[PDB]
Each structure stands twice: as structure tokens, then as C-alpha cells.
Amino acid sequence: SHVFKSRLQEYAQKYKLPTPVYEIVKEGPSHKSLFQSTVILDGVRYNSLPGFFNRKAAEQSAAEVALRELAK
């Protein structure tokens, strides 16, 4: 998904917070791995959906979750 990581970075910078950092979790068969990510921003942890096929897709999902929650 194209744009969630960059939108979250812009948010971080606007609000004087460190660049979001991503934890990447990998599981399953070595060549059918599944990925989940947690983004950490201003101390707060936001979790992606499970079951992505690569780290970037997971990270984007985590950033999406973060953005949605920051708006509530």
C-alpha cells in the first residue's frame, strides 16, 4: 500500500516526535514466510494486520493503523 509510512513520518515531524520505528516479525516456512509489523511512535505501539508476504506490506499496514488511531 503506497503511502501510509510517508504520511506517518510527516505526522511525526509536524508534531516534533522521532521518526516512527518499525519492528518486523517473520514466521512460517523459510520460503512461505508471513510478516507482521509494529510501528512505534511517541512511545505508542501500533500493530499491523498479520500474514503479509513481505516486510514493506506489514510496515505499511502498521502505519495505516497508527494514522487511523491518531485521528480518533
- Three cell numbers at 33? 514466510
Technique used by the depositors: X-ray
Grid coordinates 503479509 are at which residue?
A: 52
Q: 23: Cβ–Cβ under 8 A, 6 or more apart, which residues?
A: 37, 38, 39, 40
What resolution in angstrom units was achieved for this structure? 1.7
Helices 55-70 & 4-14, crossing angle to 10 degrees?
50
Grid coordinates 516456512 are at which residue?
A: 29
Domains and CATH numbers, the chain: 1-72 (3.30.160.20)
